[PDB]
Amino acid sequence: SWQSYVDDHLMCDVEGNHLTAAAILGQDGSVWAQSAKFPQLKPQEIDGIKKDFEEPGFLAPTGLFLGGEKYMVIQGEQGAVIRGKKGPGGVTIKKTNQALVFGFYDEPMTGGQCNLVVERLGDYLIESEL
């Protein structure tokens, strides 16, 4: 289900650590599944994300805001992945055909481990035509 993807794919422990929160939202902004601590995102934030996927670099000067919190944009994949850092944590956002997979991490988990779980699920949904 969309909820087993969140709980079993995204929240699966990678080297003992797991995401602080995860979710799959439809690109219209609606939540299909989310973990318990996932943030309430604003409309304008979901819009900035979609705009950065069309015009990469759109978010860098201003920051990646999620839940009213600022993230500093870090290197991603054009039109495919947006990554950010906020102190010892960060977030990875993977764009699929119909969705947006989000992954929030906090130390001791690393960015590489968050990228791994988030992007692999994203490539799996993309394969299933989602």
Curated annotation (Swiss-Prot):
UniProt KW Methyltransferase keyword: no
BP GO terms, sorted: actin polymerization or depolymerization; defense response; inflorescence development; lateral root development; leaf development; unidimensional cell growth
Induction, per UniProt: Down-regulated by light.
Residue stretches spanning the membrane: none
Subcellular location per the Swiss-Prot or TrEMBL entry: Cytoplasm, Cytoskeleton; Cytoplasm
Matching SUPFAM superfamilies: Profilin (actin-binding protein)
Record InterPro entries: PFN (IPR048278), PFN_euk (IPR005455), PFN_sf (IPR036140), Profilin_CS (IPR027310)
Gene3D superfamilies: Dynein light chain 2a, cytoplasmic
Chief location bin: cytoplasm
Tissues of expression: Expressed at low levels roots, leaves, stems, flowers and siliques. Expressed in leaf epidermal cells, trichomes and stem epidermal cells. Detected in phloem exudates (at protein level).
Family affiliation: Belongs to the profilin family.
Name of the featured protein: Profilin-1
Origin species: Arabidopsis thaliana (Mouse-ear cress)
